[PDB]
Amino acid sequence: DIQMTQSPSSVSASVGDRVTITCRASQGISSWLAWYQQKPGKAPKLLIYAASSLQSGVPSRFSGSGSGTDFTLTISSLQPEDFATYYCQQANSFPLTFGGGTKVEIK
Template structure:
């Protein structure tokens, strides 16, 4: 049995606090990918202008609250498996999963919070699991 995990770009969700300009845009990619368990998966999320290291990655599984994976661009969240790695600064950010597993099926969000007061810009990639016989 060959198990694959495609990721599809669902779109860009922009949330702004009242009275705050939202000039920074995020574009998460790839729009789709296919990987087998054990593979390394990489998701990128470039910003239209520098957000320094004020950047985070979240994972949300169906029916659960979002879980912080990476904060300050590269720091691993509490209790997060070391197979998750965040890299980048300024405008280019990457989330890598070193060894994909079925339980990694989730929606992944990239988030910048460099402005004051904070604005939140999220792009999301949803993963699902497919089995081919």
């Protein structure tokens, strides 16, 4: 059916930096996407919803430029708490499937 892929993995930085992740597709899925972050030891939140829109008092500075097939996510600064795994999930067809997952950790 529809399968999603994430190109980067294990991207590291320090407190003052700027990173970027990208999630690829294989079909149309115009402007419908979701993101998640799984803080270790807990259950994931939602933060970004659809494409380029926030949700429920997120600390902001997290924006994802829209596109037609392959999308992107960027941040402008890092904190000693932003350390987790990130996922991308589509919301177009019914047999909904998640992506692989990218790891981010400071050094």
